Amino acid sequence: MRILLCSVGTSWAVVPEAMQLLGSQGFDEVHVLTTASSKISPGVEQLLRYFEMHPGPRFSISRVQDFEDLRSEQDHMLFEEVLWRWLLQRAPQAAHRYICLAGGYKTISAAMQRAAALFGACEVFHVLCEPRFGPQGNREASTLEEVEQAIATNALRFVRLGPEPGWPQLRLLSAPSFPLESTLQGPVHWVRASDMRLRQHVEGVLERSRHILAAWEGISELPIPALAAWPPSHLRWLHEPLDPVQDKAWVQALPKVELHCHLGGFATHGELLHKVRQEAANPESLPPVRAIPLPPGWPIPEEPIGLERYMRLGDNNGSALLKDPGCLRAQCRLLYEALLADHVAYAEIRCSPANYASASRSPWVVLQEIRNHFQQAMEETPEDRRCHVNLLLTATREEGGDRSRIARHLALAITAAEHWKNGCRVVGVDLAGFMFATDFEPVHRVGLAVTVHAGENDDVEGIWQAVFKLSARRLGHALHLSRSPDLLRVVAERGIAVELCPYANLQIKGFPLDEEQEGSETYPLRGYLAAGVAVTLNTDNLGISQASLTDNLLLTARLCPGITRLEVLKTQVFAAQAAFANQAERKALWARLAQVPVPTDTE
Amino acid sequence: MRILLCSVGTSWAVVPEAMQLLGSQGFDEVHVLTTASSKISPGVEQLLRYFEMHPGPRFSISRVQDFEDLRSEQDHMLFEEVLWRWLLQRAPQAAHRYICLAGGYKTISAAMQRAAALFGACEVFHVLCEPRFGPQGNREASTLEEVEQAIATNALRFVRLGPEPGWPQLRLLSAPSFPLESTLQGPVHWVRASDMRLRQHVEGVLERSRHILAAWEGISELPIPALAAWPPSHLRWLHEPLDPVQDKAWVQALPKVELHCHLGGFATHGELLHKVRQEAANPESLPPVRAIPLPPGWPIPEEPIGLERYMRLGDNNGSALLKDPGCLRAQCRLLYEALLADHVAYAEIRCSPANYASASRSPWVVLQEIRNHFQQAMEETPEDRRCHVNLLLTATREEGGDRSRIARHLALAITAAEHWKNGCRVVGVDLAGFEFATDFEPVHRVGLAVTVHAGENDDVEGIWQAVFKLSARRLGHALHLSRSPDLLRVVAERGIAVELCPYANLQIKGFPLDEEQEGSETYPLRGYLAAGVAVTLNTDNLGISQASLTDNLLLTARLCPGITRLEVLKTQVFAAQAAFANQAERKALWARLAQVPVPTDTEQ
Numbered sequence A: 001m002r003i004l005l006c007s008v009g010t011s012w013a014v015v016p017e018a019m020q021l022l023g024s025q026g027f028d029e030v031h032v033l034t035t036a037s038s039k040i041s042p043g044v045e046q047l048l049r050y051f052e053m054h055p056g057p058r059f060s061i062s063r064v065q066d067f068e069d070l071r072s073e074q075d076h077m078l079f080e081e082v083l084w085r086w087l088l089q090r091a092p093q094a095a096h097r098y099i100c101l102a103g104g105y106k107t108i109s110a111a112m113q114r115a116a117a118l119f120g121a122c123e124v125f126h127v128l129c130e131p132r133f134g135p136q137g138n139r140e141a142s143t144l145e146e147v148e149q150a151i152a153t154n155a156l157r158f159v160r161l162g163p164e165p166g167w168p169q170l171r172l173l174s175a176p177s178f179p180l181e182s183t184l185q186g187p188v189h190w191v192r193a194s195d196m197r198l199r200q201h202v203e204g205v206l207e208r209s210r211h212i213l214a215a216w217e218g219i220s221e222l223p224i225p226a227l228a229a230w231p232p233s234h235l236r237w238l239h240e241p242l243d244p245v246q247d248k249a250w251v252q253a254l255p256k257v258e259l260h261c262h263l264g265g266f267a268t269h270g271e272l273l274h275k276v277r278q279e280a281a282n283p284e285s286l287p288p289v290r291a292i293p294l295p296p297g298w299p300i301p302e303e304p305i306g307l308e309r310y311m312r313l314g315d316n317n318g319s320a321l322l323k324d325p326g327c328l329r330a331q332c333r334l335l336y337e338a339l340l341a342d343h344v345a346y347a348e349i350r351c352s353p354a355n356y357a358s359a360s361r362s363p364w365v366v367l368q369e370i371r372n373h374f375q376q377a378m379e380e381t382p383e384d385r386r387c388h389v390n391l392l393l394t395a396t397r398e399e400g401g402d403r404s405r406i407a408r409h410l411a412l413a414i415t416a417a418e419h420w421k422n423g424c425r426v427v428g429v430d431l432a433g434f435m436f437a438t439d440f441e442p443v444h445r446v447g448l449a450v451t452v453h454a455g456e457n458d459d460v461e462g463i464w465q466a467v468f469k470l471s472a473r474r475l476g477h478a479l480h481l482s483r484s485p486d487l488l489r490v491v492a493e494r495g496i497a498v499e500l501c502p503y504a505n506l507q508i509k510g511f512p513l514d515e516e517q518e519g520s521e522t523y524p525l526r527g528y529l530a531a532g533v534a535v536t537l538n539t540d541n542l543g544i545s546q547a548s549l550t551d552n553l554l555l556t557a558r559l560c561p562g563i564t565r566l567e568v569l570k571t572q573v574f575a576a577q578a579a580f581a582n583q584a585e586r587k588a589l590w591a592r593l594a595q596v597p598v599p600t601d602t603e
Numbered sequence B: 001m002r003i004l005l006c007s008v009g010t011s012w013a014v015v016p017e018a019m020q021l022l023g024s025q026g027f028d029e030v031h032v033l034t035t036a037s038s039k040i041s042p043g044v045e046q047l048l049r050y051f052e053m054h055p056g057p058r059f060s061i062s063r064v065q066d067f068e069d070l071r072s073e074q075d076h077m078l079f080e081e082v083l084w085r086w087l088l089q090r091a092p093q094a095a096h097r098y099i100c101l102a103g104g105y106k107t108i109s110a111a112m113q114r115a116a117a118l119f120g121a122c123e124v125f126h127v128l129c130e131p132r133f134g135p136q137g138n139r140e141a142s143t144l145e146e147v148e149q150a151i152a153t154n155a156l157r158f159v160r161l162g163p164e165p166g167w168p169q170l171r172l173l174s175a176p177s178f179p180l181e182s183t184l185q186g187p188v189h190w191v192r193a194s195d196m197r198l199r200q201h202v203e204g205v206l207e208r209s210r211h212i213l214a215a216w217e218g219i220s221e222l223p224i225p226a227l228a229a230w231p232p233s234h235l236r237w238l239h240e241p242l243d244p245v246q247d248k249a250w251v252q253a254l255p256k257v258e259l260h261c262h263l264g265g266f267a268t269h270g271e272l273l274h275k276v277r278q279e280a281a282n283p284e285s286l287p288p289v290r291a292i293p294l295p296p297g298w299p300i301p302e303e304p305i306g307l308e309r310y311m312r313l314g315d316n317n318g319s320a321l322l323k324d325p326g327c328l329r330a331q332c333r334l335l336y337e338a339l340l341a342d343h344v345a346y347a348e349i350r351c352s353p354a355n356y357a358s359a360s361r362s363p364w365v366v367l368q369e370i371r372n373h374f375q376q377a378m379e380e381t382p383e384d385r386r387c388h389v390n391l392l393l394t395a396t397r398e399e400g401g402d403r404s405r406i407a408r409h410l411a412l413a414i415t416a417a418e419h420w421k422n423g424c425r426v427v428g429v430d431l432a433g434f435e436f437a438t439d440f441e442p443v444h445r446v447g448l449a450v451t452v453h454a455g456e457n458d459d460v461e462g463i464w465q466a467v468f469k470l471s472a473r474r475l476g477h478a479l480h481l482s483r484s485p486d487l488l489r490v491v492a493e494r495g496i497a498v499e500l501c502p503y504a505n506l507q508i509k510g511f512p513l514d515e516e517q518e519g520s521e522t523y524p525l526r527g528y529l530a531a532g533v534a535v536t537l538n539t540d541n542l543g544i545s546q547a548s549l550t551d552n553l554l555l556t557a558r559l560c561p562g563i564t565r566l567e568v569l570k571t572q573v574f575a576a577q578a579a580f581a582n583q584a585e586r587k588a589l590w591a592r593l594a595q596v597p598v599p600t601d602t603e604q
């Protein structure tokens, strides 16, 4: 197939002359674009007579109804829109497209050239006639007899500009997406453009292509590969230090990943605690609301309060309340609502079903109820904003105490790992208080991921036994990793993720704030990132800490001077990579992460 | 700063009319480019006279010496080549670039528009003059007085096309890189260009940009990000099954990574063995050459010969030959030469220095000699072709033999890990036994990576012990992972690399070859790849197996039906990520891997 597109102005001989570009072979069909000027109607009638006298290929003449003459840039813009739509309609395939640029204004020929360059064309050529005609024998063909004699005498020279490859993302557009209206006035069509959707789309695609090519060199330094389409100014903004007050909206709109979120520390105080209590199935058995005065300056304490006091601050919830089915359901639904409000795309909630068991409610029943509450919450949310939740069972070694709870939690995890295979799942266990792995072989045998929850001890020996004796894949609260260079190198090389909770660490350990340089007591985020460690920022306890994931992300701007927004994105990508999700969950999380919000202050 | 660029044809009045685009402000710099036709000269004197008055802006007129008419498209190409250089020299900055396409040929205005699009400019506009001038008041202004009247009567209409950013790869181009030969003839510069390098550069840049845009969609499925610049036909070629016979040249040129290579099994026979023996320091203690007949059909045996016979095949080299300093030096140099010939960019060599020690040569001396030979060989190679070599110490359990060597090798590795920090290094220890949990705590405490060299058995329990008790980061010859589903899932999730040797596994174990479809006994390479396991292809014993890394990669096509060359690239990337390298070595390896050879038979 071969389709020829030609533009005509005051001279009608351009079409018959360009029809002889291929010689005796001819064109399978020639299409002519025309303006609305009345000065060209005799040209149109002569072209129609020529076409009738030369039957064969399909003929169609298109006139721009709204373009009578070139008076301003608006007329040229409308002509460009109409020409693009007409080329799409009459030339669906760029390999079958032949374009002639003899006729039209000096801008119209450039319009055809640009259209061929963008949307592609098999060949773009210019038809010329040797001046030997007229009464003086110096003009070119102008009448039917003159055009016929010019074609016969071979007074025509064609300038073949060569095929135009076009662009990959503009070579796939189709006419039905952007239709064109044509009013037939005799054998010539009168076309018009209803709107400029096609041109706006083309301009946006070209701008996106320019953005992609500009940042193409150096794309491996970007966390999200889809982030390379950002404008260079926005990337420069991304490479700047985070502002805790200016970037609140951007951090809030970010799709985040949660990995350290204790379920029993969500509704410890405030209105959420009363909302949970009012949902109790047996309201008479609710324990009295004791007085738990928060330290002054919460959530930013003046001085560190210690792990024991931090634990004691959450005595109004947990095993006291969640032994009631109604309180447990309310806690689960409120936690899911809080996760949705913070734009979290993947969360791993760690719970202790054994603590919540009753005489008639075994730990298995409690775990099943928690899983079903989370699954029902997930299934009631649209997939475009659904936060996938997985469960970690918390086995804790307490001072003295009984070892039955640890065994029960391990067995419950080892059972739930195979019971559920879709939706909310038990993805692993975390070992809090354990350096002693003799009963942890079965969890490794069944493929359960293990994360070790580091405690008050600032012992490098604990982070060693977690890595090489507990076979931990994530370390929680590993703030003293830099004290042993060998351990830091091992953690970086083996890809063990270090999950950090800014507010919890500040309230328990305490770190300098709003510094200008990196000190000896400074928060170890930037040091870990510079060493190649996979660092993740989490919330720990939403209720006790009284800070969401966005607040934790923003607080790094104060804890670590010079923290950049790209490093926040790096932490999010590290959390996504370190999650215990499967293939489908990981691909869904990656799809969610690609939708990075656009900045609001340019650069 | 505002520079105006205009073309001039038969009508010189276009430049003065375009001079009033901004109004009274004018242009701080205006340049005129035209052809060498004699008809352009009177327009030249008219423009010079017009520049005599209104002397505000800077003036210059350029004429293409070799371009006069539109009678040759090659003239058009030369005109474009001179045009781009003239625009770069006269309009170095696109932001300060104001281009007018009123004058000149239609192709001249097209060149104006194309140059503005490619290189960028602040504004492209067309100037229109009312015909209410000249005799009869029916022609556009063409004289000094007529032009001034048109300017002073608001008779000029301007069509500002709008700002054009230009492509990123063409905006940073500089005039000095593409000089223009200008000769002064009065107030006009006669410009000429010696080479068409600018046009070729532009064409290559646009072609590469088109390829990158086409491949942008599938950017996460490409193991090497540099493959996005490949043409779409080549990318489609990359996704077809590997052909062992027609893809040998492409595989031979690939920058490969070696993770499983034994030093003592490189020159077990052939002319390499004779060269190593000739290089002996004392040619009287050399053991007599033992007659070891290779199994028929080598390197592709008719039937698998087992591990014991495969080990015995290399009895002419190793412990009973490498105790000679000259033999050891020749061994190391020949191994490095073989590595270079295969285009290997990173290699990890496994050696047993204790087995090569004598009364006057302690294991440390042997290890230091091996390291220094490899480092010296590396330093004599250019950095662009240099193959970085690291060392792995093999601690092999014996069948109730010696136990002192298993400790001496570990101590030697722990010492060498701290001794050397640049060039060749000892990066880990190889465990060829227990596949001992109390013997490797010191290894882990110093940051040494351990690779478990499984073999001569099919037991998932050994793999479990290696992964969880030995803390192995790589597994060798783990061909039975699929038999245990939990083990396969754990290996996939923990990012443990599996070192597969095609020729060695085929010779020892035996697998079906050239089978049309996969089966129960098929090679587990593609099954491992589909499960998310990081698989690597190595050589094991270069000498005993009698096959190079390229041979192994090609034979993987026969072992695994319908394997694509993109899978080969994926295996190379997996080997690069699984190497026990540091930041500098890893970045150098990544830089080397980015130079994927271009395919040659992408025509079907």
Ligand SMILES: Nc1ncnc2c1ncn2[C@@H]1O[C@H](COP(=O)(O)OP(=O)(O)OP(=O)(O)O)[C@@H](O)[C@H]1O
Pocket: A261, A262, A263, A264, A265, A307, A311, A314, A315, A317, A318, A319, A320, A350, A351, A352, A355, A394, A396, A432, A504, A540, A541
């Ligand atoms: N930041 C922390 N540091 C140390 N231990 C913690 C921390 N947060 C929670 N824990 C411990 O985790 C254990 C189990 O966590 P979970 O979130 O399931 O709490 P819980 O069962 O509701 O707690 P409780 O009933 O003791 O208040 C609890 O015993 C708590 O002591």
Ligand SMILES: Nc1ncnc2c1ncn2[C@@H]1O[C@H](COP(=O)(O)OP(=O)(O)OP(=O)(O)O)[C@@H](O)[C@H]1O
Pocket: B262, B263, B264, B265, B307, B311, B317, B318, B319, B320, B350, B351, B352, B355, B394, B396, B432, B453, B454, B455, B504, B540, B541
């Ligand atoms: N393909 C293999 N499969 C299993 N074990 C192997 C393999 N190749 C080598 N080994 C083990 O590695 C040890 C060292 O092999 P290497 O190639 O370095 O030669 P070597 O030091 O001369 O060996 P040897 O002690 O047999 O003389 C061998 O003794 C054997 O224990």
Ligand SMILES: [Zn+2]
Pocket: B260, B262, B453, B476, B540
């Ligand atoms: Zn081996």
